Amino acid sequence: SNPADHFRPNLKALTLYAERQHYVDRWLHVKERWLAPWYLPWWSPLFQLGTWYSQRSRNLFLVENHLSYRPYKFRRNDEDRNNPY
Amino acid sequence: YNMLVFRDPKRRPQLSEEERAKVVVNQAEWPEEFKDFDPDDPYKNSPEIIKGMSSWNLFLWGVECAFIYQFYELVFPKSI
Amino acid sequence: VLFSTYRSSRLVSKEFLHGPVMRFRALGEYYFQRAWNGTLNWALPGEYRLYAVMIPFIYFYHRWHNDHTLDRDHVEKAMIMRWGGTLEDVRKLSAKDQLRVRCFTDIEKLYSAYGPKDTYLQPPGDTLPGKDFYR
Amino acid sequence: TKYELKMQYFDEWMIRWRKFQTESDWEIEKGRQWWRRFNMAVSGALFCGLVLYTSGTATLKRQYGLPHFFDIGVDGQAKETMLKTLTSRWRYTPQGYGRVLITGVPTYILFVTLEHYRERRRMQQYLQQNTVFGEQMRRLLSTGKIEEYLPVNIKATLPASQQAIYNY
Amino acid sequence: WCPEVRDRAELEVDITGWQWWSPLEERRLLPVRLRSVNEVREIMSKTQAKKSA
Amino acid sequence: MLLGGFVPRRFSQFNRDPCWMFFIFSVGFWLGEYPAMMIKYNARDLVYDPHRYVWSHHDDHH
Amino acid sequence: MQGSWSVLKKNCSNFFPGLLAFAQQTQEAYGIWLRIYNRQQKYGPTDFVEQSETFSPDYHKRFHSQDKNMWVDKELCTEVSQKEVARLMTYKLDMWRMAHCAGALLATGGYAIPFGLFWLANDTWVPSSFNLTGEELRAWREAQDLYRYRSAPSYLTDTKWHFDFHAYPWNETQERAWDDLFEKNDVRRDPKVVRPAAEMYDGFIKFELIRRKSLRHLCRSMNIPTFPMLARLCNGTRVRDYWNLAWCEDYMVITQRLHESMTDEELYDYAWRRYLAPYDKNLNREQLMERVEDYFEFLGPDFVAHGKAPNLVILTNYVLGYYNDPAYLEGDISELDKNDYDHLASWGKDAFLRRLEFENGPLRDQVEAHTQRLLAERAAIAK
Amino acid sequence: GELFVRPKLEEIPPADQCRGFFGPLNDSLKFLRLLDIKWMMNRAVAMRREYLIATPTLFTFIWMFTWKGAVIYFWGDRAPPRRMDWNTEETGRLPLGFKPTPAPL
Amino acid sequence: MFLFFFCDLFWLRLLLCMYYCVWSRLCFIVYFNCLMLIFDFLLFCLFDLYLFVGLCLFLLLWFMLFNLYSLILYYCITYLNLYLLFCIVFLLYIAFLFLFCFLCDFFLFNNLLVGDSFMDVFFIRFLLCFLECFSLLCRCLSTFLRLFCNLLSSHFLLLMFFDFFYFIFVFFFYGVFCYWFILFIFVFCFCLLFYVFLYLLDLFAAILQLFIFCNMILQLIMDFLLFLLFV
Amino acid sequence: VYTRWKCDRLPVFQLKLFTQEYPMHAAVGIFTIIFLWKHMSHCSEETERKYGWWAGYPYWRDPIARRNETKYKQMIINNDVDITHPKWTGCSVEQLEELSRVV
Numbered sequence A: 001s002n003p004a005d006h007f008r009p010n011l012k013a014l015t016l017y018a019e020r021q022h023y024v025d026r027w028l029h030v031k032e033r034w035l036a037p038w039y040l041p042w043w044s045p046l047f048q049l050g051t052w053y054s055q056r057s058r059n060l061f062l063v064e065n066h067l068s069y070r071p072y073k074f075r076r077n078d079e080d081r082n083n084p085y
Numbered sequence B: 001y002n003m004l005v006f007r008d009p010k011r012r013p014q015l016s017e018e019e020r021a022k023v024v025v026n027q028a029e030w031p032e033e034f035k036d037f038d039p040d041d042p043y044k045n046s047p048e049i050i051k052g053m054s055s056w057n058l059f060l061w062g063v064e065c066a067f068i069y070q071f072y073e074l075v076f077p078k079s080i
Numbered sequence C: 001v002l003f004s005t006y007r008s009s010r011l012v013s014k015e016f017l018h019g020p021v022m023r024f025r026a027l028g029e030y031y032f033q034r035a036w037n038g039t040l041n042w043a044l045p046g047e048y049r050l051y052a053v054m055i056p057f058i059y060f061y062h063r064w065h066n067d068h069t070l071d072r073d074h075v076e077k078a079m080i081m082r083w084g085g086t087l088e089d090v091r092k093l094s095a096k097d098q099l100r101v102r103c104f105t106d107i108e109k110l111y112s113a114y115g116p117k118d119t120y121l122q123p124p125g126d127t128l129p130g131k132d133f134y135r
Numbered sequence D: 001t002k003y004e005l006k007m008q009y010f011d012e013w014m015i016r017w018r019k020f021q022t023e024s025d026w027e028i029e030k031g032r033q034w035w036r037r038f039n040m041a042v043s044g045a046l047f048c049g050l051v052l053y054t055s056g057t058a059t060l061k062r063q064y065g066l067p068h069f070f071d072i073g074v075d076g077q078a079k080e081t082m083l084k085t086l087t088s089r090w091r092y093t094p095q096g097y098g099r100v101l102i103t104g105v106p107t108y109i110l111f112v113t114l115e116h117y118r119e120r121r122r123m124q125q126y127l128q129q130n131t132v133f134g135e136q137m138r139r140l141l142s143t144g145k146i147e148e149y150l151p152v153n154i155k156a157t158l159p160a161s162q163q164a165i166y167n168y
Numbered sequence E: 001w002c003p004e005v006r007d008r009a010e011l012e013v014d015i016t017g018w019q020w021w022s023p024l025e026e027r028r029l030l031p032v033r034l035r036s037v038n039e040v041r042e043i044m045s046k047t048q049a050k051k052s053a
Numbered sequence F: 001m002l003l004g005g006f007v008p009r010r011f012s013q014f015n016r017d018p019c020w021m022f023f024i025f026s027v028g029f030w031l032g033e034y035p036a037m038m039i040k041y042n043a044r045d046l047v048y049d050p051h052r053y054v055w056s057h058h059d060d061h062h
Numbered sequence G: 001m002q003g004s005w006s007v008l009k010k011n012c013s014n015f016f017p018g019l020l021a022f023a024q025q026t027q028e029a030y031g032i033w034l035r036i037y038n039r040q041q042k043y044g045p046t047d048f049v050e051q052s053e054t055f056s057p058d059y060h061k062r063f064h065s066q067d068k069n070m071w072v073d074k075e076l077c078t079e080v081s082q083k084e085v086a087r088l089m090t091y092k093l094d095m096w097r098m099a100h101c102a103g104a105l106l107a108t109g110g111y112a113i114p115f116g117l118f119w120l121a122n123d124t125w126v127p128s129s130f131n132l133t134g135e136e137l138r139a140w141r142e143a144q145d146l147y148r149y150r151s152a153p154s155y156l157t158d159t160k161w162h163f164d165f166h167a168y169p170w171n172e173t174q175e176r177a178w179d180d181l182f183e184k185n186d187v188r189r190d191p192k193v194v195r196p197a198a199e200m201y202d203g204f205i206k207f208e209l210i211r212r213k214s215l216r217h218l219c220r221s222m223n224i225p226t227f228p229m230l231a232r233l234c235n236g237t238r239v240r241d242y243w244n245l246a247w248c249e250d251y252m253v254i255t256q257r258l259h260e261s262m263t264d265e266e267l268y269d270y271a272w273r274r275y276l277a278p279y280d281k282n283l284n285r286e287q288l289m290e291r292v293e294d295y296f297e298f299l300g301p302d303f304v305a306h307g308k309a310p311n312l313v314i315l316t317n318y319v320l321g322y323y324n325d326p327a328y329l330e331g332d333i334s335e336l337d338k339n340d341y342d343h344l345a346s347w348g349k350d351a352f353l354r355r356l357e358f359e360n361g362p363l364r365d366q367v368e369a370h371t372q373r374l375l376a377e378r379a380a381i382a383k
Numbered sequence H: 001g002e003l004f005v006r007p008k009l010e011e012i013p014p015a016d017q018c019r020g021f022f023g024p025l026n027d028s029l030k031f032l033r034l035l036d037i038k039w040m041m042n043r044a045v046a047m048r049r050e051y052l053i054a055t056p057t058l059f060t061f062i063w064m065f066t067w068k069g070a071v072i073y074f075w076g077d078r079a080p081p082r083r084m085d086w087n088t089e090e091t092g093r094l095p096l097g098f099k100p101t102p103a104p105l
Numbered sequence I: 001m002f003l004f005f006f007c008d009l010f011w012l013r014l015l016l017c018m019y020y021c022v023w024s025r026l027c028f029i030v031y032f033n034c035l036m037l038i039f040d041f042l043l044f045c046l047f048d049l050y051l052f053v054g055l056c057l058f059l060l061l062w063f064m065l066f067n068l069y070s071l072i073l074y075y076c077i078t079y080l081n082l083y084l085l086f087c088i089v090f091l092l093y094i095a096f097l098f099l100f101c102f103l104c105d106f107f108l109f110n111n112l113l114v115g116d117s118f119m120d121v122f123f124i125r126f127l128l129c130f131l132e133c134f135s136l137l138c139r140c141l142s143t144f145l146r147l148f149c150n151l152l153s154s155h156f157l158l159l160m161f162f163d164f165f166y167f168i169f170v171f172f173f174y175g176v177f178c179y180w181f182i183l184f185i186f187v188f189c190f191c192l193l194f195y196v197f198l199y200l201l202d203l204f205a206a207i208l209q210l211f212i213f214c215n216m217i218l219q220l221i222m223d224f225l226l227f228l229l230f231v
Numbered sequence J: 001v002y003t004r005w006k007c008d009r010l011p012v013f014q015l016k017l018f019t020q021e022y023p024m025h026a027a028v029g030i031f032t033i034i035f036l037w038k039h040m041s042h043c044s045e046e047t048e049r050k051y052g053w054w055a056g057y058p059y060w061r062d063p064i065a066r067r068n069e070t071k072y073k074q075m076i077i078n079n080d081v082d083i084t085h086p087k088w089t090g091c092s093v094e095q096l097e098e099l100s101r102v103v
């Protein structure tokens, strides 16, 4: 135990936390702001690169019909194997 | 010779025995630092960096610093 | 047109800070630019004195950091947990008492896996406080 | 019109509030998936056709000539038929950047156009829905903002065993 | 003050020619040296004979 | 690569080069910190913490 | 060349006239290309028309074969004149750069405008049509020559280093040819001496086996846009087309001796399109004729006899050798009287440096003798 | 290892010589060549087109080692439970008396 | 979660800036074989076979600045994590593999089908091909696992031995003044011998492990290289 | 003569190095970075308590609770959230007042 503790980074300075929802929403707002202007047509490769893959992935998530339960990604406690909630 | 893993470099001879035997050694031209030069102890007459500062003095200086490092809190303890 | 892609577009004069730079280069070159200073993949030099100087310095500053920043956390945790479970409780002690506690922590560190196990295992019949003392 | 910028927020909200996904919305998404696969298939077919048409004569002769891997007889007949059909008339056979453009730009345009108009179709479908997702879509297009916790505000339907929270 | 060597070395490294040994070119150029007077006489005689022929 | 440099023949020559002067100072620190620990941590008046059984790292990591 | 505000003003002023001129040139060049393409398809060899496949022996990757996928139309003079071919070549260069810019515009929508500002500020990648006066054209040609100077040495060094590191010539004549091929432009290379290098390199790397990095260097040296490079068979196709047109024009000129009747400016342009005559060299007609005749001699009798040019890699190296200027040397020789390590003088010599000076100085023989005698005495005493 | 030279048209053995799982699929059994994987493998080896066997394998491994492995690990559907929580199809519908906003017009 | 931390190379970066503002020759390289792939003259490769030299040199420098200096007490190997090493090896190995695969030459994989035509294709050759394709990925995994495990085991052993030496030196040196001094002197001499032996072993093992780390990557590259003969 | 390493500035050389010298390696690295920040950028509170603290989690002050309290107070104050709304409490305001009077 004590010997194992010697293999840690020794210059940790600061830790910041952010919810996935929050920064995903902020990123989407940035993307909408930069892809909104008229001088970037929807058929341009840049616009499709920005939008199509995200749309496809979100559609795949929505279509999902799984017989098992996937525990919430951001639970308070994910260390207990016998408690998915 | 060696000091731990540090080995003293040695110059390879370049003269043959015949040519070498004809060389006349005149130590009067040599610098005072290197007279009676010995490959096994070339720095015996080398000057000290600081006059009067012995190697033992520096070793003892380090020992005293270690003692201070370990004993200062015994005399001037501080609260958490 | 705004910024040049070539390193030849100078931003300062050739003589800017010439003196300090030359002193810095003199410091760098005196011991390193030598025939016997042949490095192994730029990391291990051939000059002995570079080892003799840099190994102690690296150890010294690493040890200072470890003693004053890293192990201090464990020491403070032991002091807090063994003497009230709160920082104010520890501060209620005197500096001498804290010194004693910290030096006992050092003892435990030096024993580690080879010292006596009565330093943390309470023998049966011992009269000293147990784990439920502050609970 | 750029429907993706409006729809990304809606899709993220639906994922976050997927509990209220009716079977109709699920069918809508499955149809979107099917149409995406269909668009991929037709675009790939167009790309293959353009590649084959612009292929060099020697390339076609090597590809659709002897030997035959199976040598059943139908294989040789089909290969000879295709080779004759391609080599009968004159074909513009560019190389390099030109073949890249000819083979790719039509494919990209077709795929992008189909996908964009299917996205518009999905937006209309969700607009016509009589579920909480449809109401959220209409509110999004009206106010321009996604109203989270809408299902619990307007008290969207819940299973009979979970209506206690609405009991106020 | 030896620009040709500088330019060649820099260019070779910039085009992924890291190696600093050229055994084949050395093999081509290693035995090159200015000739002796007698060798010059022989070569001049050969050239004169060739021109006469 | 350990190719060359000043190499003192014996202890007394460590003072013939500044780098080896620093080295011998550091060696003094290294070797002299052990006697200090012997004196400090084997002292007669050193007392174990009375509350050493209240908490230990062993129960924490377990 | 670096961007400048004056060039930006020049290109912004002449933007729309330049576009109109480019469109007119596009119509004319399409007509010329249509004539050439019809003639190629009708009278070309079966391999050339059918685009026969030539694969590499190691990874079986297709690339253009100089013998089969290139064809010199000896009877093109009937349908297309020399000037029309030159016009088509110039338009091909301009069209390539314009096409890349248009592709960037279409790809990035309106976000390419600032990059367009960077583009118009430099004459490196603008079409020749943007210059409406002689001075503007001269500056544009200077920019092209600067890019050629920047790019050619890397190509030459790549070729030479790879061959010299992995192979050697077979015989003395090949050795001389290889050595003289890569001489700087300040000396005149004899094409007869240098020609055997073509066959020697044909043994090593034909045009069908040219590597992608070497191709990138070559296209940089030819003022061909390289971004996006993509597969090597795109810019390779561009190179093949350009040099096929050049060889057709060369056959026309050699057969009809047009260069003798060609005027000074047209002759200079003809050499420049072959990468033989930089404009900054201020060459006269004698020098231009000498270089053109050397180029024709390098092509060799077999070019006229059968339309077969030497190896294209070696040909490109030979012609681009005219942009391999001597390495610059500026500064009076008196500068060699200074010292470089005066800043270390204050440090003096430590014990080890003093020992090294003592042992390897003028007294080195005496020290060696004394040391060896002492060691011998000690060894004798030990025994 | 060494350079690979494609066989000439005359060096390729006839299809009838190839063997399947049990035996050659000669006349009256030619159409079974499409279904017999071992016959196709032997034919590919005979024609020196061994890549048809090797390329699909390696790529598949890469596809699993790179992209599908993590997808299955993080987003795959585990085995269903014994007592299954099916959907009653009651959630989502708007409540009675609710006035939905008008659609765009 | 975003953790802000720093590597343990800042002093070494300072030394690099100080000592390499001027040029110096390099004549000793841990993995020299990346520079000499071809040993028979007149052989040449159209593939960019010297592309690995720069990455090899930088990787050697980085791993040496970390691993070799980690022998100094309290020096931290900041990157010592299993999955981080997996990421590094994944980058290098998969990048080169994708370089060979993007070549779109399927014949390059002909050698994967092990054996000759005599061997049964389905029951022998195809199973060997399966095993070899598996072995490529296993080579990647083994490379990163071997680099991680060596460092971890060596440093664990060093820490434990140092702890034992501190214990006996501090709490049993008084025996020098006692009648059992000979036992303590024997133990102390044994500990010094063990100390020197461990340090030498670690110094050798670090360099050797870097050599093998680069050798695995170069072996991946060499397995797919084809050399033409000059004529 | 022109060389990328000697003539170009550092950002330009960086782009050239990772676009015309090691483009595949850069692509794979970016791929791996995206994967790491998509699947290995989360830590639960229990995980932080078990492993997130150098000497162990200081339960005697519970910094995680204080951090969350600051977070939620900031969100409530900035977003003007009515935490007494029935959806948060599950009961009407009048029932809440009745409960307050009871307890």
Ligand SMILES: CCCCCCCCCCCCCCCCCC(=O)OC[C@H](COP(=O)([O-])OCC(O)COP(=O)([O-])OC[C@@H](COC(=O)CCCCCCCCCCCCCCCCC)OC(=O)CCCCCCCCCCCCCCCCC)OC(=O)CCCCCCCCCCCCCCCCC
Binding pocket: A056, A060, D033, D036, D037, D038, D040, D041, D043, D044, D045, D048, D049, H059, H060, H062, H063, H066, H067, H068, H071, I098, I101, I102, I103, I104
């Ligand atoms: C050149 C490169 C070389 C170097 C390689 C280097 C790398 C190593 C190689 C290995 C790869 C390493 C991995 C690196 C990471 C790369 C990314 C990655 O892995 O992403 C996977 C990732 C996996 O998805 P996911 O994110 O995990 O989500 C899973 C969901 O399934 C996602 O759902 P979705 O909604 O996105 O839809 C996906 C859909 C994708 O598919 C579709 O959308 C539909 C189909 C598309 C077809 C595309 C065109 C094909 C050609 C058309 C026809 C041409 C000829 C025309 C003329 C004909 C004349 C007669 O797939 C499916 O869902 C499966 C549907 C299957 C239906 C089967 C129905 C049964 C009947 C048909 C099969 C059985 C027939 C039996 C016949 C028997 C006869 C006897 O993405 C995908 O695979 C899907 C999106 C991309 C699709 C691209 C489609 C084109 C593919 C290329 C085809 C052509 C080239 C191949 C042949 C070459 C021959 C020379």
Ligand SMILES: CCCCCCCCCCCCCCCCCC(=O)OC[C@H](COP(=O)([O-])OCC(O)COP(=O)([O-])OC[C@@H](COC(=O)CCCCCCCCCCCCCCCCC)OC(=O)CCCCCCCCCCCCCCCCC)OC(=O)CCCCCCCCCCCCCCCCC
Binding pocket: A045, A046, A048, A049, A052, A053, D048, D051, D094, D095, D096, D097, D099, D100, D103, D104, D105, D107, D108, D111, G060, G061, G062, G063, G230, G231, G232, G233, G234, H059, H063, I104
């Ligand atoms: C923001 C936009 C995002 C875009 C995303 C899309 C990707 C990027 C787009 C394009 C980017 C620009 C650059 C592309 C590469 C340029 C390459 C190049 O320089 O080529 C020069 C070359 C010109 O040189 P050339 O001398 O004229 O001819 C080449 C020589 O023959 C050369 O002679 P050779 O001796 O080298 O001969 C060999 C040559 C022979 O090939 C050729 O050169 C012929 C042309 C290619 C034919 C490919 C089709 C083969 C047959 C497919 C059959 C599929 C059946 C499936 C049926 C399914 C039924 C259920 O190559 C091959 O043999 C390679 C064959 C391909 C193997 C593919 C293996 C894939 C393995 C898949 C692994 C698993 C994947 C994941 C799992 C999926 C499933 C779950 O160009 C071409 O030949 C054609 C270039 C086409 C460029 C791509 C066009 C892109 C269109 C995009 C439409 C979709 C957009 C979607 C947007 C989404 C929203 C944003």
Ligand SMILES: CCCCCCCCCCCCCCCCCC(=O)OC[C@H](COP(=O)([O-])OCC(O)COP(=O)([O-])OC[C@@H](COC(=O)CCCCCCCCCCCCCCCCC)OC(=O)CCCCCCCCCCCCCCCCC)OC(=O)CCCCCCCCCCCCCCCCC
Binding pocket: A043, A044, A045, D094, D095, D096, D097, D098, D099, D100, D101, D102, D103, D104, D105, D106, D107, D108, D109, D110, G026, G029, G030, G033, G095, G096, G098, G099, G100, G101, G102, G103, G104, G106, G107, G228, G234, G237, G238, G241
């Ligand atoms: C609106 C949707 C947009 C979609 C998104 C697009 C995104 C941008 C990508 C680039 C798009 C093209 C940009 C315009 C290029 C200019 C036109 C052109 O081809 O110039 C000829 C020229 C041909 O080059 P080459 O090397 O000589 O070609 C060798 C051939 O052997 C040459 O053959 P040859 O030796 O036998 O000689 C023939 C020559 C003989 O002609 C002449 O000598 C006369 C001159 C003719 C060409 C004139 C070009 C002028 C360019 C400048 C235009 C003015 C710009 C003004 C700018 C300022 C405006 C204010 O005539 C040609 O050049 C014909 C070439 C073949 C035609 C290519 C066009 C195919 C696409 C268009 C049809 C699409 C239909 C859609 C249907 C939809 C169905 C569903 O093109 C280029 O320089 C290549 C483009 C360079 C940039 C490449 C960038 C990467 C491309 C990747 C594309 C992958 C697929 C798409 C998906 C991408 C996703 C990532």
Ligand SMILES: CCCCCCCCCCCCCCCCCC(=O)OC[C@H](COP(=O)([O-])OCC(O)COP(=O)([O-])OC[C@@H](COC(=O)CCCCCCCCCCCCCCCCC)OC(=O)CCCCCCCCCCCCCCCCC)OC(=O)CCCCCCCCCCCCCCCCC
Binding pocket: C001, C002, C003, C004, C005, G001, G002, G003, G100, G101, G102, G104, G105, G112, G113, G115, G116, G117, G118, G119, G120, G121, G122, G124, G125, G227, J011, J012, J015, J016, J019, J027
């Ligand atoms: C109205 C006009 C007419 C209509 C339009 C017509 C069409 C126009 C478009 C087409 C034009 C084409 C021709 C363009 C030529 C010029 C190109 C160029 O740039 O030349 C260099 C150009 C100068 O050229 P030059 O002086 O003429 O020299 C040319 C020589 O021949 C030297 O030449 P060289 O060859 O040596 O230079 C080449 C160099 C070109 O590059 C450069 O020179 C770099 C330029 C940037 C340097 C920046 C240095 C300064 C950094 C400052 C940082 C910040 C400082 C602090 C600021 C504090 C502010 C408060 O390197 C490259 O070529 C590298 C290319 C790299 C390509 C990257 C591709 C990535 C692909 C990704 C992977 C995908 C894989 C597939 C995945 C598929 C998955 C499915 O550079 C500049 O002028 C530098 C400008 C710097 C601007 C300020 C710094 C950035 C400001 C950013 C503001 C952001 C605001 C928003 C922030 C929002 C935050 C939320």
Ligand SMILES: CCCCCCCCCCCCCCCCCC(=O)OC[C@H](COP(=O)([O-])OCC(O)COP(=O)([O-])OC[C@@H](COC(=O)CCCCCCCCCCCCCCCCC)OC(=O)CCCCCCCCCCCCCCCCC)OC(=O)CCCCCCCCCCCCCCCCC
Binding pocket: A016, I002, I003, I004, I005, I006, I007, I013
């Ligand atoms: C809220 C609290 C504040 C924090 C906010 C943070 C916001 C975060 C947003 C969300 C981000 C999410 C993702 C995070 C992922 C993190 C991953 C990570 O850390 O990986 C480990 C990894 C460790 O890398 P490494 O191996 O240690 O090497 C990186 C080192 O920087 C060393 O590498 P290198 O040496 O190769 O670097 C090149 C180096 C080459 O060497 C040098 O240039 C030497 C200098 C090195 C400086 C950098 C090292 C920093 C050392 C520690 C701090 C120094 C003291 C600071 C004092 C603070 C006092 C409070 O050059 C530079 O560093 C260029 C900058 C030079 C600045 C010089 C300034 C001179 C000013 C002079 C003024 C004079 C005024 C006179 C007025 C007179 C009036 C009369 O970190 C990174 O790779 C970088 C991560 C950065 C991610 C982006 C973060 C966003 C930007 C935040 C900027 C905040 C600015 C405001 C702060 C204000 C004070 C409170």
Ligand SMILES: CCCCCCCCCCCCCCCCCC(=O)OC[C@H](COP(=O)([O-])OCC[N+](C)(C)C)OC(=O)CCCCCCCCCCCCCCCCC
Binding pocket: B004, B005, C043, C044, C045, C050, C051, C054, C055, C056, C059, F001, F002, F026, F027, F029, F030, F031, I015, I016, I019, I068, I069, I071, I072, I073, I162, I166, I199
């Ligand atoms: C190419 C091969 C290189 C081999 C080099 C061999 C070096 C030989 C060193 C001999 C002993 C040195 C003793 C130093 C003592 C320092 C002071 C001290 O107290 O330290 C005690 C420390 C630790 O001793 P400790 O563990 O007894 O400490 C006790 C402290 N308590 C009780 C609190 C725990 O000693 C060391 O850690 C020294 C180990 C050295 C191992 C060799 C490292 C080589 C790699 C780094 C090379 C750096 C070169 C940089 C050059 C510039 C580069 C650009």
Ligand SMILES: CCCCCCCCCCCCCCCCCC(=O)OC[C@H](COP(=O)([O-])OCC[N+](C)(C)C)OC(=O)CCCCCCCCCCCCCCCCC
Binding pocket: A053, A057, A060, A061, H065, H066, H067, H068, H069, H070, H071, H074, H075, I083, I084, I086, I087, I090, J031, J032, J034, J035, J036, J038
């Ligand atoms: C305590 C527990 C310990 C567990 C330890 C487990 C091991 C962890 C090891 C971590 C370190 C090593 C990581 C090595 C790298 C692994 C890579 C990996 O598997 O990542 C896969 C993952 C898969 O991504 P994904 O997980 O988002 O997959 C989406 C699939 N659905 C939507 C169905 C859920 O890749 C990424 O995360 C990067 C994705 C973005 C970059 C690629 C985009 C292009 C995709 C092309 C195909 C599809 C689009 C169509 C074509 C393009 C059109 C423009």
